[PDB]
Amino acid sequence: LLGWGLKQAEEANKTPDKPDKVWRIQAGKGFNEFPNKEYDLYKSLLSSKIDGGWDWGNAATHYWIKGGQWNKLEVDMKDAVGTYKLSGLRNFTGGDLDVNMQKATLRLGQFNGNSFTSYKDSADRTTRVDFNAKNILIDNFLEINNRVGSGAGRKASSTVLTLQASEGITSSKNAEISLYDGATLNLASNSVKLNGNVWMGRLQYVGAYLAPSYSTINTSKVTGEVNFNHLTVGDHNAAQAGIIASNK
Amino acid sequence: LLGWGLKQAEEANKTPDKPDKVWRIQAGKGFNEFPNKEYDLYKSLLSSKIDGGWDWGNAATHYWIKGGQWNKLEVDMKDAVGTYKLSGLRNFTGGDLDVNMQKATLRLGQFNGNSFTSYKDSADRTTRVDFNAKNILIDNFLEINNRVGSGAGRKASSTVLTLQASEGITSSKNAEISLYDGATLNLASNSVKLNGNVWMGRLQYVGAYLAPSYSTINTSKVTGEVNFNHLTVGDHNAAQAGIIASNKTHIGTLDLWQSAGLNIIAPPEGGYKQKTEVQPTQVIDGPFAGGKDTVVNIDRINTKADGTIKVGGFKASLTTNAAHLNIGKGGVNLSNQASGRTLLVENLTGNITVDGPLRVNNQVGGYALAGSSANFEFKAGVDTKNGTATFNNDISLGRFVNLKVDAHTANFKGIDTGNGGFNTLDFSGVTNKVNINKLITASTNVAVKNFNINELIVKTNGVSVGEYTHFSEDIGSQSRINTVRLE
């Protein structure tokens, strides 16, 4: 009932969290010497400090960082040349990644899509999931602030999916970006061209036909040519989405 | 499920522990004046501050340091000349020994072997058991990270057995080194020669047929001649062991499992080298390239294969990113169950030179039934793509055995697949040439991109029609066959 103009203006100015256990992973040698290798990046680097899980209540998978979602991590490559896929991170609760991948083409999809959620606990935390790749090339679906299963388990709090590549964030025809009730996302490359389903706002729960369900795609400093193809605001609710674009 | 390449790269960079009660023992006088005495070293020095025990649950013996395993000790001799045996330390839980024995020959065996375990408590501690002897001369068995008895009592956490002598770590014929699910061990002398059973990975529990069971023998700075004799990776599990050697690794008998792995990794070229709480920089490497003179002379490969029957193969591997992979005269063996067993002889950034005959079920031709399609596999110079798979020996395929090579210029000398037929003689990843000198095919699935097979044999297959030598890809421009012979 608040309105998006209040909500984004008060959520774009926060402190991130209080993360204890700042795990600091760094890619060493071997990664930075094959320009065409097509690494995986979940199992080949991340999956030591990202654990699976089962929730008592609507579980299929459950991912956080390490011993509770109130922990950070980081990944400081800055030289690991290749092409890195994610391929299958579903119901990721986590917190405060920043996969700092200089000189690395990204991909977020092969044989499975992705998800980036948090939990509505007593902290009501964000996720602040950054990336710093070279392209991005999303190339499969992505479910920012989705539901765990259906109804059971817990509630989901907000999130941020910043994505700050440096060549152009293209996408695919079958890449349905489905950001929900709380999710925003920045972008800061030049010449985004999302050639797939941008789905701002959805029924996060199946019965909640009366959610406000805000969002934002704050493509804030995109210095080239913003270009959507298929924007689908709202689904069975008054989804008051917003976009703060960059004057084209 | 993590993989060894993550596990060792995150376990080689830790803090040891938080030990209270740093007992500091020091050998005084009397020890340093008999060069030939043959001391015992458990009872004569250690056994004041190492106590026995009984566990309620699967106990025979139980050793720790003093009042709980969270205590260190040390032994600072640095002059105690003699020859010191251990002889009988079984189920040692302990923690953080470093028996600093300068100018002292060691021994770890007489009338009884040894063990070095920890416990999987709420701390999940290592053991970090160092030594600093002059030779080592293991000379009996050793059970690093073993089980207490069987099942009962408690679980076991990780361990480290560093062994940093200064003359050469030999061993005995009856010295079975049995490192298990968690155990690693460094070595840093020159010219190791383990002339006994190296057993990486074992059933730590009797029912746990599904453990990952990693290990490592990081013979990291061994400045002389690494030399195994009998390496036996895996036992009824997918034991993904690894070795980070020092660019000359002669080994002898390799006895893998169906589904156990191996990662013999060469050095790099230059050689090696409330409140928010900040973990240290957990540096982790990726799969890198060997140096130039990185030699891996695995001169006999065997592969046992027994158990139940799965829908497919199991594909034991040995990722070997040295800039060579010579395989000598025993060549390649395999053993085949009802499903086709599979061997994965990779090389990331080197060559392959197999001068030995391929066998399966230990015969040169190696016939196999239609369901048991044995799958040999070679990947020479994968991530450089100028890697050759030279087979300087006459290979021989029986029936339902499968070769595939993904190399740059896979040279050969002689191929025998027409004796049995039904042999998937794949060449799907060959960059340019397959310079086979002699070819025998009857009912074969040869597919070469470019070649010059300067002699051809075209055999029949009795009465079966439709089954023949079926070239199934591009033969291309520079191709050549200097002699075709239809029998």
Swiss-Prot record, chain A:
It comes from the Bacteria. This is Vacuolating cytotoxin autotransporter. The chain holds residues 60 to 307 of 1287 of the full protein. The signal peptide, cleaved at the inner membrane, guides the autotransporter protein to the periplasmic space. Then, insertion of the C-terminal translocator domain in the outer membrane forms a hydrophilic pore for the translocation of the passenger domain to the bacterial cell surface, with subsequent cleavage. Induces vacuolation of eukaryotic cells. Causes ulceration and gastric lesions.
